Design a binder for this molecule. Structure first.
Ligand SMILES: CCCC[C@@]1(C2CCCC2)Cc2cc(OCCCCCCC(=O)O)c(Cl)c(Cl)c2C1=O
Lengths: 313, 313, 313, 313, 313, 313
């Protein structure tokens, strides 16, 4: 629904890179389903499995009908063609689905989804209160504010015991970084293996007569373009993931230094949050600090004290 | 709607695995209806009903036009090819539909659908009531709270007599486990029977002249890849099903023990729910214990006393 | 809308069986319009207008180019092939459409659709009314309660004189049963006429030279698979329809015995319903008896009294 | 908008017949675009521009390569095939579009759309008022009641001068019947020009060498099936239209006799609507008579007097 | 939204005609992408750039394989085929997109979209206020009415100074008329230059061996049908546009004649709107005069004085 | 949502040009993947690696089968065909995606998205309140009037510090202008390369026997048409971007003088906005100046004082 408030800028660029990855994966997949044939001809003069390259010119007659051209095309396409040419779109579709599942497992797991839903509910109610204006700058509104005070205190006593959300959000980015590393380790190593002019030697003499054939796989340049684009796009994804991993392993997100807002607002009775709530408060501060600024007045003892004083008067 | 509360975490992994099942099923189906052909050539020298493997090289002339090549391709495609190589996408699509119907029959059945809707409505209303904050730690909401109290008192007697929800959720998982057992029983046995080389001896000499042929089914490798992926993914599905069946036969879900709320909430008078409401309370406890914690205040005669002296005074 | 209460489980299983029959119909139709060809070859030796079946092997030369292969393919495909092999997907799509029309004509015909929507509206309002709590356990709410009383009395005086809903729901299921009988009557008789090998004798000697041909129909096995699947699915559909017809002609749904509820609710002055209102009373009791549970108090004259002296006092 | 209440039952069957017409039109269209081929062979021996039909058998060699077979297929497909075979899907699609435009121009025209919207709004407000039950069987309800009375007296004077809706819905049905007459006049006359066997005598000897050819249009049987289905289905359409035309020129919908409501409601003072409002009230009665019955209270002068008495006391 | 108020009847027929123009455009486009080929044969005997046209008959042998028929087909398709046969669907797609852009630039331009949105909002608020029923024929209603009065006066002071909507609607309709003139000027001139048979002479003897050719373009009849249909449809479009241009240049739409409603409402104090607002009131009068009747009381000085008297008393 | 008010007219024309660009890009892409063919023929009598062009006419025989023709087509399609003839649709799709990203990045970045949405929300709320018209021409209305005064003061204190929105929306246009310069710089330089006639000398005699081939790219004319259309569309896009860049560097949008509204309304105690607030207020003044004028009252301290006087009274 309105879960955009728990997404930083590095989780949106990820969400669009993982969309264009799906785009190129589907495009390569449908193109490989559509054509992906390889045209093969036999060499007459051959030495050490290499073609010898030895009035008016006339055509060379091989004396083959079409159907055993199709057979040798299928055989040399299956056997002597490197597998990375054949199944590259089906690899990258799997990789981008694993990336999407790893990105959205944090939302879809219920043990943290409930906590996130309750958190966004109480922050929406805290943001849509009128009495924070008086707290920062009638009896029914005061008791309504007291009800918000009690439910915010209940949330604070509830969620500050666990570590599951922070642990899950650590374990998502660490395996994203590992997957990026593995992708870069094999894909650029095998990307040279696709090319156009390819030989084959498939040992079928009893069916055609020739021993060695020279083939021409014609989608190779386009597949090379798509693979290079995929390499650059995965590089960008990995730089984003490495940056956010460094940020989260350096900035010590477990506790929130809340004193800076309270010093200027002169509300000294608001302490630091212990764990698993200060992390989400950091993450919404990464959206904007105004939401965390409006949350001080719903956890300050002087603020409940003026609330009950106004209710008594 | 708001039925996502009733679905545990293992019912979401299942619901996404059963989606990618249908994805690979429709992919195999569209590939098979698009091409699924096979190219056959005859062997001139026959030994043991096989191919004997017996100045420049020249082609071998069979003296066959294209159309009887098409005929022998069709005959060797039907008579000498295993049925698992042809109808595997339709088979896995059928099994995917069986799993989906098994998972949603417990919802669309009306006798349990009515009880589930009633249960989720009273949990939403009890979760939205503000009297829980006063009970754990104006008057007109007191009498509507009394109305909710009477509604819960009616519902508790109304659903105590049943067992249908627990029976259906037992039966659905046990037949899902049986379906897993059969699927892994036959698929891994028959998966070896698809291969790129197939020899056919279809006994048509009056139409072509040759007796034995030698073919090349070009999609065998891709179908083997899809089948192995399907087997591993079914293995994940069945591991989840065996885990949830073990949990059901282990934790004794028929009755509920309620003292873990009452001991720390200081409400000495609370009952223990008997059956078919205890199971649903377990099902929402798997989501979170907070909903069961806020449901305790609507079940105590001392809370009835608090409301009665509250709205009298 | 919210007419889904009026559908029992036997009218939801039917609704998915219709969907899956439409799915197999459109799949067979798109496959048949895609290829559905038939490869044909002539036989060089003829006995009883059929193929006689009479150093190394060599091919047989027929001396026919491609175009007069295609001509004889078309001629043998039209003149000497059973019509059930060609128009089976169109036939089953037509049957699925007429089953859907027989399902939804009851809901789209206005002279009963108006009665159904009025009925479901007043049952929703009567079930959601707050006076049922005190009925089963102020003053202006009493005025809306007696407005509900008067509109229920108006509905009872109006719709009881009809018979059209019961008449239509007779005449829909009975013709569904007749159509099942017809489908099972012809389909299992004509299903054995599809096969892979077919011999056409078409008497075209001035265009090719040969007289009798032999043909292969590669789609025969898959069409037989789909046909057997459709036969089994129709048998299950007709079992559902015969069960609901047996129940409906057994229990004699014209009048309701309302005496069961007043035995425990101690409201002896609640009468029986004559006709064409007890029908949907049964039809909503099949959903759940709670809606008829919370409807007795809105038609009884002692409840009229209880509201009347409540407003008086 | 809310125009579903304005459509009688004879415009419900029409709206689905017009959908199945469009679906068979688009099926024929995709057929005729996708393949719609013709296969042609020459006759060596001719007798008055007709084929004379004159050890082992051998083929007949025509000495024609494939591309001048394609040429003679093109020329014999255009010059010697009837136009009803080629453009029948486009004809039926055009007629379906004209039927839809004819049946919805009555709604899309603004000069009557405004009147229909105002009419359905005031009947919704007449149906929503609780004062009707009080009139048939405390002061603010009288205020909105008298507002509704005054706006009904405004509407009745506003819409009584026109004659536009009745005239347009004359013209709609009468041109629908006329188009029925034309369709059945020409389609069953031209349906016999589609046939599997077609003979062309084009006399292009300078490019092939032969004079006459004997062709085979392969989709003729399926096109004949579709055409016969279309004829029967548009016959059903025309019988529906003729029935509603006869109904509308029999029942004399210009004026509304309205005695049947006042005789059972005891309201001796009510008038008869003159024109152009009587027809629409007949139409909503044809939906159901309840809305026409409930409209008597907002026009009777004694009802106005009772409302004025309740507003004064 | 509900912006159908601001579109007259001549701007809805225009919209539907634009939709069917785009439909035939995309149909012709996908047809021309899918096949659009042409079959060409050489003429063995030539006289003045034309074919000389000179036991049993035998075929003519050209000794040309299929691929150099494909070459001559491509060459004679590019050079000696008229371009209007080639790019007519793309031309008509461009024309219908230009027509849609011209029809919606008036709405999407914000400098007029603001005025249209404010005008339609004010007219709807004037329609929905219940004080109009009192005005044409207790203090909160008067305050709401006087707030509406002052905002109507401020809106009148606002929009009377500009003149941009009328001028943009001028510049819209006049370019629509000029574009129609251009389309009809060139399309009927070039429509005669598509035909089935066409003679090409491309001077390639070093590759094929012949000089001139005879060709056949199989889509010519369908393209001519679509072109004639488009010309008739564009004629209808231009008749509609010239009619509305004549009406709008004849009625002098800048200033309103508001006397004919004040003389029957007996509100003698009402001013005539000068420009750019009276044109909008003319446009709403083209929908219905009821909105003009209800808008009279929200500008009358005696209506303001009656409201002041009601507020004071 | 409500961001359409806050987008000038030069971001709607751009937003439609950048969907026409995507439409022609996807059309070119699907055409190129569908056909991707070019027909090549060998030249016998050659000079300087070019085709020298050195009873009745007869065809020229090359003694080549079809599969060698396919091979030489593939080779001359890869090597001697320019890359701009092949990857132009993918290039223009990439440029379209870059333009769309530069269009929507200023929305999707959260650090400015928060400011933009908060600004548009408070503008909508200030436009919604009726007290503005009273100020520019019941104490509870003053209470939320003072609440909106306070939160507008908080907004003015908050957003006026930074410059990020102005910096981003300047950077986006300057890089769009740079991208325009690059595209126009290279596309018109490379557009001359595509043509129907292309020669190739690929040095493969061991496989065919010939050395030079003359070819024909049958889609070069349509690709040239699409390229010229794209160049014109790019030119119009760049003119729009040059206009908005000149507008930015000419109006000096950093501060906003507020003199006109205070001069016409005699509210002399109004301030001048410093930065990052004047920019967005300019950008909605481009929509209409009335939204800026209705915000004048809420910044006015004499309006604050007169509200204080009304609250005192
Ligand atoms: C007039 C003399 C005929 C002799 C010929 C030789 C070929 C080897 C032995 C003789 C030439 C030829 C061309 C054909 O079309 C071109 C090759 C296949 C493309 C079909 C398109 C598709 O892929 O659908 C076909 Cl089909 C045949 Cl059968 C034959 C022959 O028979």
């Amino acid at each position: 629904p309105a879960y955009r408030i728990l997404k930083p800028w590095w989780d949106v660029f990820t969400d669009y890179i993982s969309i264009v990855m799906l785009m190129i994966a589907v495009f390569g997949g449908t193109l490989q389903v559509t054509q992906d044939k390889m045209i093969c001809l036999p060499c007459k003069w051959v030495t050490k499995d290499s073609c010898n390259d030895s009035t008016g010119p006339t055509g060379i007659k091989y004396d083959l009908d079409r159907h055993q051209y199709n057979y040798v095309d299928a055989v040399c396409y299956e056997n002597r063609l490197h597998w990375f040419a054949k199944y590259f779109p089906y690899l990258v579709l799997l990789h981008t689905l694993i990336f999407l599942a790893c990105s959205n497992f944090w939302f879809k797991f219920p043990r943290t989804s409930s906590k996130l839903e309750h958190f966004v509910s109480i922050l929406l109610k805290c943001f849509d209160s009128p009495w924070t204006t008086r707290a920062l700058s009638d009896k029914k509104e005061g008791e309504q504010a007291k009800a918000l005070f009690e439910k915010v205190k209940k949330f604070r006593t509830h969620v500050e015991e666990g570590d599951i959300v922070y642990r899950l959000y650590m374990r998502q980015t660490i395996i994203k970084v590992i997957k990026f590393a593995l992708i870069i380790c094999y894909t650029v190593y095998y990307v040279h293996n696709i090319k156009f002019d390819v030989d084959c030697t498939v040992d079928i003499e009893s069916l055609t007569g020739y021993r060695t054939y020279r083939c021409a796989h014609p989608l190779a340049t386009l597949f090379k373009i798509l693979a290079s684009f995929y390499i650059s796009l995965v590089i960008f994804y990995g730089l984003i993931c490495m940056y956010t991993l460094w940020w989260m392993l350096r900035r010590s997100l477990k506790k929130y230094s809340f004193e800076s807002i309270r010093e200027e607002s002169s509300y000294s009775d608001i302490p630091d949050v212990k764990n698993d709530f200060a992390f989400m408060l950091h993450l919404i501060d990464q959206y904007d600090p105004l939401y965390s600024k409006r949350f001080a007045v719903f956890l300050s003892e002087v603020s409940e004290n003026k609330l009950r004083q106004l209710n008594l008067n």
